[PDB]
Amino acid sequence: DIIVVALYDYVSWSPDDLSFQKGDQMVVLEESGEWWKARSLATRKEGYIPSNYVARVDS
């Protein structure tokens, strides 16, 4: 799996986008655009996230 760490807080206003908290670990599911679909290893909730707020980790 490709993992990312949240370099900032993001708040979604839409149930399609995945609000996350800085330091959260997410699994990317789709890297299609500048916005990526991911899943929260914490919450198991999915959504789209702004890719410039995350940092890829080779962990």
Partner: protein, 106 residues
Amino acid sequence: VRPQVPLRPMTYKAALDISHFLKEKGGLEGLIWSQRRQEILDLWIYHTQGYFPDWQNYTPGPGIRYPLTFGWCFKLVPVEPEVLVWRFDSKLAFHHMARELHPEYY
């Protein structure tokens, strides 16, 4: 203390979803319109969520200004003291006035 989220093309559901988010958050329904006040709204979204700010357009008047982007569910209503007020209408979720009165579409 946060970057500018990548830009992304707006869409019925985006409009719809934003429409909901503000309706709920309150402080818009029955607010007096302005060129500026709209720009503040409209900027904060581009900044926050990546939707450029060229979607919140409305039909010319005089009378109720109906929104052009299907899914935005806020119309600009004139009241008595012509001054305009942001106003929510669920019917707008499904009824696309602007396209009725008149094709700036296709």
